Design a binder for this molecule. Structure first.
Ligand SMILES: Cc1c(C)n(Cc2ccco2)c2ncnc(N)c12
Length: 167
């Protein structure tokens, strides 16, 4: 038993809810919250800017130190950093950005990062400002992630479409 409430069960391990990933993290304080990161960990808008804003920019300060030491992530890659006031840990995962020409095949590699963590609160990778088809992102999630993932979908309209079209 865990602290996640109000989720619709899609599979043995995948759950979904119409929720802002920021308000959900503040309420639950999960072990792992996933950020929809870019390779530079520049948390300008979308999930990364809302998560970063909720940390009062501490996520960006930590991220800049990480990049100054390690250089950029890979598209499809991740790093674990602090969750600040939102979670124990933040898993920064880089899904491909369709609006930059990145190979959508890298979405599966992105979701494979989630398997290193028993339980996660996450957004749909490449949804929102990343520009991918969210229906596709949910299918890759279900077919790739084997650990327990709690998906927060910001848009109520999209949430209802994801549920009603789910095979
Ligand atoms: C700010 C934000 C974005 C852009 N997204 C991704 C998305 C999916 C559909 C509409 O936007 C989010 N997803 C979960 N929580 C959030 N706060 C967000």
């Amino acid at each position: 038993v865990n602290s996640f409430s109000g989720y619709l069960k899609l599979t043995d391990n995948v759950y979904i809810k119409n929720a802002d990933i920021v308000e959900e993290a503040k309420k639950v304080k999960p072990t792992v919250v996933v950020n929809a990161a870019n390779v530079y960990l520049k948390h300008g808008g979308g999930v990364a800017g809302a998560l970063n804003k909720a940390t009062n920019n501490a996520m960006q300060v930590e991220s800049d130190d990480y990049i100054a030491t390690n250089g950029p992530l890979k598209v499809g890659g991740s790093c674990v950093l602090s969750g600040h006031n939102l979670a124990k840990h933040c898993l920064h995962v880089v899904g491909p950005n369709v609006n930059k020409g990145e190979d959508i095949q890298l979405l599966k590699s992105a979701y494979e990062n989630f398997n290193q963590h028993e339980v996660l609160l996450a957004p749909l990778l490449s949804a929102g400002i990343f520009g991918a088809d969210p229906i596709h992102s949910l299918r890759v999630c279900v077919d790739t992630v084997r650990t327990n993932v709690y998906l927060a979908v910001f848009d109520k309209n999209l949430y209802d479409k994801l549920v009603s079209s789910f095979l």
